[PDB]
Amino acid sequence: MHSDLTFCEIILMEMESHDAAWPFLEPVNPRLVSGYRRIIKNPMDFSTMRHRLSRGGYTSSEEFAADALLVFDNCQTFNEDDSEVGKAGHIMRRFFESRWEEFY
Numbered sequence: 001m002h003s004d005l006t007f008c009e010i011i012l013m014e015m016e017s018h019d020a021a022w023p024f025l026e027p028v029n030p031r032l033v034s035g036y037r038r039i040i041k042n043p044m045d046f047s048t049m050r051h052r053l054s055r056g057g058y059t060s061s062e063e064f065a066a067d068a069l070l071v072f073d074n075c076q077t078f079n080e081d082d083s084e085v086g087k088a089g090h091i092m093r094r095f096f097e098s099r100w101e102e103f104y
């Protein structure tokens with residue numbers, strides 16, 4: 001588990017500092033985004049994952065991956081692939097997938 005969570009801290013650090021991370025560093029404000037609340041049932045973002053890691057809320061690295069993948073599933077559900085947020089989400093999703101795979 002210490003091995004699991006060490007990897008999680010590395011990959012989240014790397015995602016938080018990525019150029020394409022800007023749509024995911026804070027929760028979407030649904031008051032500012034028409035339709036977000038109706039369409040996205042389980043919002044997720046990097047600061048929520050950071051907060052959860054800080055309070056010890058992740059037991060395994062599979063839990064952590066489920067949150068990361070939820071970020072990018074939400075992104076592809078709500079944003080067009082050719083939108084600014086959609087393009088950034090594909091960059092971040094490919095980064096995470098490839099980085100997760102050269103560990104496990």
Ligand SMILES: CCc1c(C(=O)N2CCNCC2)[nH]c(C)c1C(C)=O
Binds near residue numbers: 022026027029075079
């Ligand atoms: C276009 C709105 C949007 C942002 C976004 O612009 N920001 C993230 C929140 N903090 C400020 C910047 N991020 C996402 C994942 C979305 C949507 C609708 O999926």
Ligand SMILES: [Mg+2]
Binds near residue numbers: 097
């Ligand atoms: Mg693949």
